[PDB]
Amino acid sequence: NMAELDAMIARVKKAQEEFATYSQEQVDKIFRAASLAANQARIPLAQQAVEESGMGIVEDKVIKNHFASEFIYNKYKDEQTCGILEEDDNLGTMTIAEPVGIICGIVPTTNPTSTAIFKSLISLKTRNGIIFSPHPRAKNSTNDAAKLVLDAAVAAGAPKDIIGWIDQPSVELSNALMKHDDIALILATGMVKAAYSSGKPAIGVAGNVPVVIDETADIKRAVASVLMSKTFDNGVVCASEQAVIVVDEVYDEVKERFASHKAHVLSKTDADKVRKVLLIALNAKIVGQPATAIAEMAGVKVPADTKVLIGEGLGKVSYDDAFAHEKLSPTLGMFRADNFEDAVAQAVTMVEIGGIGHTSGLYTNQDVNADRIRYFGDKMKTARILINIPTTHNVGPKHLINKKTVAKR
Amino acid sequence: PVTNMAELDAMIARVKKAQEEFATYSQEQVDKIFRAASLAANQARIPLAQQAVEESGMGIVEDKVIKNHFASEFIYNKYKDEQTCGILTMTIAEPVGIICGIVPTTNPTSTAIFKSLISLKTRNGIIFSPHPRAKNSTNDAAKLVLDAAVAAGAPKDIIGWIDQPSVELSNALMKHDDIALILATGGPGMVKAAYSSGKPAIGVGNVPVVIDETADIKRAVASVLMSKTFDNGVVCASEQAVIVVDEVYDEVKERFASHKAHVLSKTDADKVRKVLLIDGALNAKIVGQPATAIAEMAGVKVPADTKVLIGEGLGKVSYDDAFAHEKLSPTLGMFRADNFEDAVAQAVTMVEIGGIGHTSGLYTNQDVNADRIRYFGDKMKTARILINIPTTSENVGPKHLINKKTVAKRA
Numbered sequence: 001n002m003a004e005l006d007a008m009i010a011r012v013k014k015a016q017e018e019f020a021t022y023s024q025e026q027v028d029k030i031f032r033a034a035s036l037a038a039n040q041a042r043i044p045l046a047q048q049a050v051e052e053s054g055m056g057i058v059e060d061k062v063i064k065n066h067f068a069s070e071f072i073y074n075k076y077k078d079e080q081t082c083g084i085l086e087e088d089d090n091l092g093t094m095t096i097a098e099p100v101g102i103i104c105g106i107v108p109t110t111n112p113t114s115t116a117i118f119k120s121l122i123s124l125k126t127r128n129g130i131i132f133s134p135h136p137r138a139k140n141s142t143n144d145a146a147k148l149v150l151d152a153a154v155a156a157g158a159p160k161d162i163i164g165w166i167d168q169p170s171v172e173l174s175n176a177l178m179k180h181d182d183i184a185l186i187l188a189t190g191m192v193k194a195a196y197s198s199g200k201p202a203i204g205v206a207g208n209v210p211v212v213i214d215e216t217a218d219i220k221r222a223v224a225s226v227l228m229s230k231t232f233d234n235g236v237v238c239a240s241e242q243a244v245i246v247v248d249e250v251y252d253e254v255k256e257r258f259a260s261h262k263a264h265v266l267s268k269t270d271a272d273k274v275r276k277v278l279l280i281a282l283n284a285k286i287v288g289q290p291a292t293a294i295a296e297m298a299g300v301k302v303p304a305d306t307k308v309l310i311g312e313g314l315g316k317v318s319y320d321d322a323f324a325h326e327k328l329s330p331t332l333g334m335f336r337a338d339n340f341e342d343a344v345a346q347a348v349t350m351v352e353i354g355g356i357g358h359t360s361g362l363y364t365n366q367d368v369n370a371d372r373i374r375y376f377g378d379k380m381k382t383a384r385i386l387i388n389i390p391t392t393h394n395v396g397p398k399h400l401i402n403k404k405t406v407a408k409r
Numbered sequence: 410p411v412t413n414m415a416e417l418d419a420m421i422a423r424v425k426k427a428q429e430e431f432a433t434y435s436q437e438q439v440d441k442i443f444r445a446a447s448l449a450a451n452q453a454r455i456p457l458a459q460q461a462v463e464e465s466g467m468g469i470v471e472d473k474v475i476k477n478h479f480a481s482e483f484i485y486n487k488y489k490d491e492q493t494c495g496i497l498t499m500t501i502a503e504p505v506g507i508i509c510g511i512v513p514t515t516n517p518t519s520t521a522i523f524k525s526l527i528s529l530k531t532r533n534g535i536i537f538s539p540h541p542r543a544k545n546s547t548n549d550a551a552k553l554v555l556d557a558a559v560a561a562g563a564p565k566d567i568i569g570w571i572d573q574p575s576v577e578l579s580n581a582l583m584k585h586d587d588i589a590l591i592l593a594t595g596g597p598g599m600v601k602a603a604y605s606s607g608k609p610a611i612g613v614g615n616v617p618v619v620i621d622e623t624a625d626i627k628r629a630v631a632s633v634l635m636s637k638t639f640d641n642g643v644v645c646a647s648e649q650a651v652i653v654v655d656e657v658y659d660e661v662k663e664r665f666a667s668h669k670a671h672v673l674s675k676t677d678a679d680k681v682r683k684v685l686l687i688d689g690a691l692n693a694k695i696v697g698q699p700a701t702a703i704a705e706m707a708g709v710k711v712p713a714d715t716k717v718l719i720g721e722g723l724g725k726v727s728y729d730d731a732f733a734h735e736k737l738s739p740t741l742g743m744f745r746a747d748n749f750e751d752a753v754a755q756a757v758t759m760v761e762i763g764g765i766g767h768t769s770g771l772y773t774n775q776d777v778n779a780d781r782i783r784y785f786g787d788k789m790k791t792a793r794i795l796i797n798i799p800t801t802s803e804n805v806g807p808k809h810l811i812n813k814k815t816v817a818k819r820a
């Protein structure tokens with residue numbers, strides 16, 4: 001509630017102030033102890049996450065947790081985040097680190113535990129406080145993830161309230177935490193929009209990813225490549241390919257190949273029963289569900305061993321086509337293109353859905369289409385451009401400190 | 410002619426197309442536009458300065474001449490050779506799109522120059538939203554840069570502006586689908602409005618100085634005043650108050666009369682406060698006015714030759730004392746500290762009052778007091794920290810006006 005939010009915030013403020021003065025050695029001891037404990041809990045937390053949210057796959061969520069813990073630990077074990085980062089005694093200058101203070105972490109339904117572990121460990125490493133604003137749908141997964149890391153932290157010497165959370169999440173409390181004066185940064189992983197509209201320094205962490213397969217591509221490789229992501233944690237991953245935009249001459253060959261990967265191409269009529277279930281705004285009930293259960297939410301009989309649903313668009317890429325949108329599930333759109341340039345044009349449109357200009361992909365004969373690649377590179381407004389490569393082929397400590405420069409006469 | 414919504418939208422579309430064409434330009438073509446437009450802007454150094462002072466009613470013509478110079482020639486020499494287009498697996502620089510420049514009355518011509526130049530250098534389009542008290546000199550500095558870019562071959566609508574600025578349109582420009590970035594300078598309000606726009610936004614603080622007992626007082630006093638009269642103290646990140654340790658307080662205060670800095674009586678100080686802030690905000694009518702004029706509007710008598718007003722705090726730095734605020738004028742608060750740590754503590758509040766901490770300074774004996782320097786370093790939540798040096802993130806540049814894109818190939 002509104003009142004007890006303030007009291008919890010002022011606790012972590014003072015706890016951060018105590019934390020700020022710590023030695024790198026105590027920071028390191030806490031970091032390792034918090035990370036080793038999160039890793040050792042990879043399975044229990046993954047299991048808890050699956051059951052509460054009611055989506056995804058334990059074994060894949062176990063992998064997610066191991067990455068957010070041991071992998072983060074090994075990347076930043078030796079990264080300097082405190083004190084003098086640079087000196088030049090001749091110029092009489094130096095750069096000094098400064099923790100940002102208190103972080104506000106927005107955690108989604110989609111990766112409740114791994115994102116909490118990740119943000120917790122990188123806050124601890126940088127002498128920050130962090131407060132989690134979980135999604136109702138996975139409140140306990142993330143807060144118990146936060147708690148496990150807290151308790152391991154407190155036991156290696158960390159201040160009592162260096163991490164907290166909103167126990168019962170609301171729109172009032174999320175907005176209270178965000179616009180609060182002593183919260184310095186938003187780490188936000190639509191909900192992106194709220195963070196950027198709050199007056200705060202914000203880092204937003206998804207986006208719509210199109211894939212163009214042109215006439216010169218290796219069809220068998222492109223098709224397997226594009227499919228790699230869709231089944232991992234039931235397609236719950238941020239950078240992933242949402243639709244295939246295929247040049248006419250190679251269209252049918254792409255469509256036929258899907259079937260040897262257990263990707264079921266939905267008839268026109270069965271695609272419309274899925275398309276009415278994907279969107280209403282993305283429907284939370286399909287998010288991170290297997291292809292077979294999404295089909296059974298729709299009207300659609302699909303073979304038992306199917307891993308992915310393919311819904312092909314009549315007409316071009318259109319806002320009205322839900323298969324043209326980000327689906328967070330084992331689903332892909334498939335859209336027909338007159339030629340390479342047309343497919344590029346259709347990709348541009350998918351990118352505009354999302355506002356987020358994240359990543360795009362092209363499958364083509366590299367050896368002979370250098371012009372096309374450069375063309376593709378000049379026309380995609382996405383930070384990452386992938387050629388013949390899937391998205392499964394970056395917030396860090398450095399973002400949660402301030403560099404202060406000191407100049408002496 | 411942009412005085413309303415259908416006209417703003419219509420103008421935005423013309424810049425959209427201009428930027429589309431400009432995106433295609435070569436680095437050579439860009440260089441030529443960049444040189445030509447910077448040279449023209451510099452050549453209009455004086456007439457644009459004069460226009461600025463006349464219209465906004467503030468500042469010093471020949472100080473704004475220097476501002477217009479540094480926004481033009483200096484910006485040119487800094488970035489003549491900087492790569493902004495093309496190749497940098499591979500990295501491709503690309504223009505952000507259309508920029509929204511928010512231009513304040515304090516620097517109406519130099520910021521429109523600067524912003525236009527680095528926008529041109531990056532193949533972006535830019536549309537300015539001036540403040541109504543300086544709208545002509547802002548839009549005409551814009552026009553002059555535009556005309557010279559166009560004559561050097563830049564697309565027609567590449568720079569735009571709102572002819573009759575208003576809240577609804579300013580808000581609309583920032584919120585418009587087709588604006589990629591907001592470059593917002595000026596007031597705490599506007600800057601924060603750019604941060605709440607839900608768009609990528611760059612904003613262009615209240616600067617405390619501590620003078621402890623170990624300092625060189627002659628030097629500290631002199632250095633602290635250097636910024637104060639430049640364009641009547643409209644100077645980004647110049648000193649706003651001295652916080653002085655009690656042991657050397659009368660010494661510092663005594664040296665102020667030597668430098669044309671009049672120390673206000675407790676009574677006069679009170680009169681000046683009420684004129685400094687109005688409705689909690691910096692009073693527009695004192696900004697960029699000389700010390701004597703600010704004395705006149707407060708109804709306070711001051712020698713004809715005085716350059717800076719000094720208002721002494723009664724007690725410690727506090728939100729309630731207008732001299733603890735950013736004043737954008739030749740005026741300085743002066744506050745008493747019991748000792749060095751108490752000084753640092755009052756400086757901390759001044760950084761809080763300013764909002765975002767940006768710069769702070771300490772004068773000490775740096776060849777004895779290393780512990781104090783480090784101590785001041787730790788407590789000061791400011792990007793820049795200066796020891797024994799006047800103020801006289803980093804700077805906004807082309808770097809900020811492009812998105813970098815990585816292409817990854819498959820072996």
Ligand SMILES: [Cl-]
Binds near residue numbers: 049110113114115
């Ligand atoms: Cl997870």
Ligand SMILES: [Cl-]
Binds near residue numbers: 517520
């Ligand atoms: Cl100016």
